[PDB]
Design a protein around this ligand. Structure first.
Ligand SMILES: COc1ccc(Cl)cc1C(=O)NCCc1ccc(S(=O)(=O)NC(=O)NC2CCCCC2)cc1
Ligand SMILES: Nc1ncnc2c1ncn2[C@@H]1O[C@H](COP(=O)(O)OP(=O)(O)OP(O)(O)=S)[C@@H](O)[C@H]1O
Ligand SMILES: Nc1ncnc2c1ncn2[C@@H]1O[C@H](COP(=O)(O)OP(=O)(O)OP(O)(O)=S)[C@@H](O)[C@H]1O
Lengths: 325, 44, 148, 538, 325
């Protein structure tokens, strides 16, 4: 069946019938500078060579037109001294554009048209150099390779803690760099029909992350199983253990938000758990272990699971039995 | 489909007609090319 | 069909041998392109067969449906169920047309691409014949067979 | 200052080729928006391709790099304009259109300067053709801005790209692709590659566009039938179908005739090449390449358009005769079988006749051009040869008819055999309980021999057909070449004449077979439409 | 009548009698660099050409003043060798300023005044180049074209959900890029008179966004109708359904805050709903639909609305009737 947001974190819902009238502007550069380093280097050298060849062609043309390209001694001074063929013209173009200035071929004060072509060449070169420097620096601020490494266990379990049914699901870090003020927005979607005859195709509702006195955030150093307890007030409290495996369509998504240290940007990780993904009555294997002088975390047992002799019943019927016991 | 179905189909015919067909086809095509090959020398 | 397949394959082999004997170097240029055709072969059959059978299937319940309407015609005109049955028949004829349409589209695809290659080969053959068989070989009876 | 004007022409192509590369590399590093004049633009671009090939031929004949560089630059300029219009059709912009318009204007100016400096003194025709094509493309761009919001007031009032072929999952997108792929079927690459791996099914297949359904074709056909019956039959239903399917069929037919012309044209440039070398040939070779590819492309587009018109017609008349099945009376077993044959064989006959309709218009012009062309290459002797090949076409038809007759007889026997089998494969336990099975197998084999006897004559006729197929090509050349040189005028037969005659013989043998099947299909379709009219009007 | 903040999100309240004494400083550059790309390119080339022409004029003047401009052989060496007219002077200016250095015309060690003019020319050129590079890079960080695309439905509705009156209003995204930790600040303004005789011209009060156990934020993937239920404690609980359409002056504003992903900046969208804009007793059409293998959202039905046979009465009287039923 259809999923809401994929496991990798990307969104699945495809948008249809967007007005699309406003998206008719020139946002050309930034999108090109976001590209991969090889593609971005390719387009940068492409822009540079394009401008260089354009102005080399126009300079060869103007030297041909003035007649200074026609080899002749006397009765004239070439607008650009010592210019002979297209090769020397391209050499002059690259000498004046990238601001090396060899000065073997000299532009003279006889032709103001060469003055104009130089005065536009230099400003366009400076503008393209400025954009191609700002964009590559904005690129070198890419820390996206280090982000999105956060991992959740493939399937989440439910258990019986403190006499109440509880949700257990593993999170964790994958690098030395921490994530500041990471908060959990745990939500559940379902096609719901209101008592007023209204049917919604999908209904997001907040299921709380059960921490201390309050708080929507957590602290991530070691893999910490997020601990929620479904009660009679919780929206998930009504389902059954035998109907979730095959038929029902329930997506439980978690949205872990937090700002990375070095860059300061606020990233997040979204993941879904379907009705066929989640299972019943199990327990994770303890990861942390008292090593020689530290705490050793084994990620091989991260997704491992052991059987637990826990009663299997619906949360509504379990609450009724708690009222009876 | 493998060559086995066609192999059985043509072996039901027997060795008598298999070669009589194949070599005759080869020779007809050889004649059809050789006529034009000789016409090429005919031209000049 | 067996006779036609044999005639076609032998005529093709004969034509390749002719255009090779006319211009030797042209031979070495034609083996690349022919290998291209190999890749065009596989991708075709594994679909051309498939679509084919699909056509057959969309032809079978359609006709049968027709017959069912003819016999129990009084019952269907009595129940006033004519609208739903017309909907079903539009559905069936659409399912037939999509198959019989994709099949002709795929045949056109294979046709056009094989033809583009069959024109590349005559281009290369003529380009080699005009130079090799005239500038150096200076033999005119060759180019005729190759071009034809 | 010829080289000066040549460089002045080289400049704008460089300008466009340099502006395109950043945007092309951004685009290279699912809604199709079409603009007015898209098909016209692609047609004009292909004509530009042809004229640039001609300019390259001129530059080769002249040689001086700077004297033929403009053609090689305009080639890449037109290719990059194609890439630009692809990038605009895939994502619309009001600015890339202006970027193309500027280049069009500058190229027009340079060509005008060339024309003036030439008038003050082969080049003339090519320059004029380029001027005209660039001007028409400029007018197309002006139409686009007049229709778009490029420089017009605040908002463009855009078209809201068509949801007919771009809405909820559809896979067969023929009407909604680039007019080049509408010809070369490039959109099928993805389908066929995915099909190689995963087995196709109706869930993996698309859904038919709004342009071709039961409802659409039924609507057009019933509108034509209404407009024809309000003015009040077999001729009526015929003219109704004709006026209802209209432009597509004649479009296919004219594609077909143009392809036939170019196909008759190929061998003549072969002849010219053969003449030139024995006594201006590279140009003829590249022209042959271009003409081959274009002729075959047009032939294939013709086939497809005809097939699609036929499929439309089948869907339409099928849902129509089903609509008639609702209002018929109960007084009219045999009628049920006749109805289901009216859908299983009569409708297929109608649709296959509509397949072969444009071939019936394109065959006569093909044989006429063939005979007149071969006459001017071989003289009076050609006429004699032109008879022999033509004489195969009626004979073929006769042969075909015999086949049909034989078929009928054979079918009869076959049916009876099946009956004598259906018993044995039902009384199986009864049969084997006393081993009377061999006694019935003897009877079954008795039927089989009669069936075998019919098959001999059928296969004899098949053999005669296959024999004539490759005998008439040999006989034409035999009785023509022997009857030309050693009979009539002893004229020296250059290799060009003989090989052009050979090519034309094959190019004429291929269509000849199809005329017989076309005649049979046409008469059978006429009978089937008379039957459909008799039924539909009871 | 007068609105508080316009639909587009801009503010309507015009400020009068600002002290304005502090706003007398030179913040010149940043405001110029914020301008449109065409205007900004125009002012950049304008600054460059201005500096170039200024120093070209001063160099022509100094060459004229030393007498080196007077064409003469011997008895002198020009402070700048091979200088003839104003054209060659401007060429020397553009050769030394933008650091190409052709070297056909050479400044000599005879005149220290030329040394001083060069030593100020180069530093002013470097400073203007540095500011004109930093500013264009700061400009290329403009992601404002992608922001503010968030859309709300033109008019909001009220319905009866779970036996209580409720507020329904659509929000939504318009691009693939998400918005992190978007929170809703829903407020209402009204001219209020306290029981102590105090009359306030406008009174903002927080009306809650009803989510799970807590939370002021939401999660935006698909258009999610914000769901609030007015109770006896809510400030909006006292109004009437027939007096809102024409006479009353009630502006209900929503402030949706959130940080975009790629840039990390915290943007927001503010919108108002007047008394004449909001209507009574209706229901939105379900947007999401179970497509082939995904969820299809149709934005044509975004603002569409269907009639619902719901009772029409005031929220105070509705609560009294709930006490009676
Ligand atoms: C044998 O060619 C020709 C050569 C020359 C000429 Cl002047 C005409 C034809 C010719 O054939 N006349 C056009 C009409 C026609 C009929 C069949 C074909 S087809 O290619 O054999 N078949 C398909 O495309 N699709 C089939 C169509 C039936 C349903 C199943 C898919 C192609 C075209
Ligand atoms: N040892 C590990 N170290 C780091 N990341 C891991 C490790 N094992 C799994 N992961 C990732 O974190 C997620 C945890 O899921 P698992 O516990 O591995 O269950 P799983 O069924 O084995 O999933 P797999 O290994 O991808 S088939 C997986 O999606 C992995 O991509
Ligand atoms: N299909 C759409 N896609 C994207 N944005 C839309 C779409 N329709 C409307 N919007 C915008 O989001 C807001 C939603 O209001 P609507 O549902 O369109 O009510 P409305 O009375 O039709 O307003 P309009 O269309 O501007 S006259 C509008 O202000 C539009 O600017």
């Amino acid at each position: 069946r259809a999923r809401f947001v994929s496991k990798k974190g990307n969104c699945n819902v495809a948008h249809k019938n967007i007005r699309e009238q406003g998206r008719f502007l020139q946002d050309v550069f930034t999108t090109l500078v976001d590209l991969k380093w090889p593609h971005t280097l390719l387009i940068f050298t492409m822009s540079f060579l394009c401008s260089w060849l354009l102005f080399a062609m126009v300079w060869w043309l103007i030297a041909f037109a003035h007649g200074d390209l026609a080899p002749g001694e006397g009765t004239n001074v070439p607008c650009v001294t010592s210019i002979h063929s297209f090769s020397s013209a391209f050499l002059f173009s690259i000498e004046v554009q990238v601001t090396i200035g060899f000065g073997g071929r000299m532009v003279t004060e006889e032709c103001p048209l060469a003055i104009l072509i130089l005065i536009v060449q230099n400003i366009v070169g400076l503008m393209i150099n400025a954009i191609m420097l700002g964009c590559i620096f904005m690129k070198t601020a890419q820390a996206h390779r280090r982000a999105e490494t956060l991992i959740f266990s493939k399937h989440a379990v439910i258990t019986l803690r403190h006499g109440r049914l509880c949700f257990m699901l593993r999170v964790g870090d994958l690098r030395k760099s921490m994530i500041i003020s990471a908060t959990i927005h745990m939500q559940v979607v379902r096609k719901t029909t209101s008592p007023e005859g209204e049917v919604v195709p999908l209904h997001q509702v907040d299921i709380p992350m059960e921490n201390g006195v309050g708080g929507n955030g957590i602290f991530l150093v070691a893999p910490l199983i997020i601990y929620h307890v479904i009660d009679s007030n919780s929206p998930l409290y009504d389902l059954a253990p035998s109907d979730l495996h095959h038929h029902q369509d329930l997506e439980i998504i978690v949205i872990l938000e937090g700002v990375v240290e070095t860059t300061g940007i606020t990233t997040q990780a979204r993941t879904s758990y379907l009705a066929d993904e989640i299972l019943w009555g199990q327990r994770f294997v303890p990861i942390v272990a008292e090593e020689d002088g530290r705490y050793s975390v084994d990620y091989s047992k991260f997704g491992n699971t052991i059987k637990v002799p826990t009663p299997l019943c619906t949360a509504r019927q379990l609450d009724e039995d708690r009222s009876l016991l | 489909i493998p060559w086995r179905a066609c192999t059985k189909y043509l072996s039901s015919a027997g060795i008598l007609l298999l070669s009589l067909l194949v070599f005759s086809q080869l020779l007809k095509h050889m004649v059809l090319v050789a006529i034009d090959y000789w016409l090429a020398k005919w031209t000049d | 069909t067996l006779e036609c397949l044999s005639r076609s394959t032998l005529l093709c082999v004969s034509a390749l041998t002719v255009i090779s004997y006319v211009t030797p170097v042209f031979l070495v240029a034609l083996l690349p392109l022919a290998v291209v055709c190999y890749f065009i072969q596989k991708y075709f059959r594994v679909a051309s067969r498939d679509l084919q059978q699909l056509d057959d299937t969309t032809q079978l319940p359609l006709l049968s449906h027709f017959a069912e309407t003819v016999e129990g015609l009084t019952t269907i005109r009595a129940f006033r169920y004519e609208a739903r049955f017309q909907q079903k028949l539009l559905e069936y004829t659409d399912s037939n047309n999509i198959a019989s349409l994709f099949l002709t589209a795929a045949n056109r695809w294979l046709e056009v691409r094989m033809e583009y290659i069959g024109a590349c080969v005559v281009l290369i053959a003529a380009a080699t014949s005009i130079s090799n068989s005239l500038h150096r070989e200076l033999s005119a009876g060759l180019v005729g067979l190759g071009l034809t | 200052n010829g080289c000066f004007v040549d460089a002045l022409n080289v400049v704008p192509h460089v300008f466009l080729l340099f502006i395109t590369f950043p945007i092309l590399f951004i685009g290279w590093g699912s809604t199709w928006l079409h603009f007015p004049g898209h098909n016209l633009r692609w047609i004009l671009t292909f004509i530009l391709l042809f004229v640039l090939v001609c300019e390259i031929a001129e530059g080769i004949l002249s040689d001086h790099l700077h004297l033929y560089m403009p053609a090689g630059m305009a080639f890449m300029a037109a290719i990059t304009s194609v890439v630009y219009y692809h990038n605009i059709e895939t994502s619309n912009f009001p600015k890339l259109l202006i970027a193309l318009l500027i280049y069009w204007t500058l190229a027009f100016i340079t060509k005008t300067i060339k024309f003036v400096k030439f008038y003050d003194h082969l080049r003339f025709c090519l320059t004029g053709l380029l001027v005209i094509l660039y001007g028409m493309l400029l007018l197309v761009e002006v139409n686009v801005i007049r229709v778009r919001r490029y420089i017009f007031f605040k908002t463009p009032r855009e078209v809201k790209p068509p949801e007919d072929l771009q809405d909820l999952g559809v896979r067969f997108l023929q009407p909604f692709v680039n007019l080049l792929s509408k010809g070369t079927y490039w959109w099928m690459n993805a389908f066929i590659k995915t099909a190689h791996k995963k087995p196709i099914d109706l869930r993996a297949i698309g859904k038919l566009p709004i342009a071709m359904r039961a409802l659409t074709n039924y609507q057009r056909l019933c509108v034509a039938f209404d407009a024809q019956a309000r003015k009040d039959g077999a001729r009526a239903i015929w003219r109704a179908l004709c006026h209802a399917f209209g432009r597509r069929l004649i479009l296919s037919s004219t594609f077909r005739i143009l392809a036939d012309l170019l196909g008759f044209a190929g061998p003549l440039c072969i002849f010219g090449i053969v003449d030139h070398l024995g006594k201006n040939a590279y140009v003829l070779a590249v022209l042959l390449f271009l003409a081959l590819l274009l002729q075959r492309t047009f032939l294939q587009a013709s086939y497809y358009v005809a097939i699609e018109t036929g499929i439309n017609l089948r869907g339409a008349i099928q849902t129509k005769i089903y609509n008639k099945i609702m209002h018929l009376s109960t007084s009219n077993e045999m009628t049920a079988g006749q109805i289901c044959n009216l859908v299983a064989i009569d409708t297929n006959q109608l649709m296959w006749f509509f397949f072969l309709c444009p071939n019936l218009w394109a065959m006569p012009v093909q044989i006429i051009v063939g005979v007149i062309l071969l006459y001017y290459i071989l003289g009076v002797s050609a006429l004699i040869g032109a008879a022999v090949i033509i004489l195969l076409a009626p004979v073929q038809y006769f042969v075909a008819t015999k086949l049909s007759q034989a078929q009928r007889s054979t079918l009869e026997h076959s049916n009876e055999r099946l009956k004598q089998t259906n018993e044995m494969l039902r009384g199986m336990k009864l049969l084997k309980l006393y081993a009377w099975e061999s006694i019935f197998c003897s009877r079954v084999e008795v039927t089989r021999r009669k069936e075998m006897t019919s098959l001999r004559a059928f296969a004899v006729y098949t053999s005669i057909s296959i024999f004539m197929n490759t005998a008439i090509p040999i006989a034409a050349v035999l009785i023509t070449f022997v009857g030309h040189v050693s009979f009539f005028k002893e004229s020296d037969l250059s290799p060009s004449v003989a090989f052009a005659s050979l090519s034309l013989f094959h190019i004429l043998v291929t269509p000849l077979f199809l005329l017989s099947s076309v005649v049979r299909s046409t008469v059978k379709a006429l009978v089937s439409v008379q039957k459909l009219s008799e039924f539909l009007s009871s």
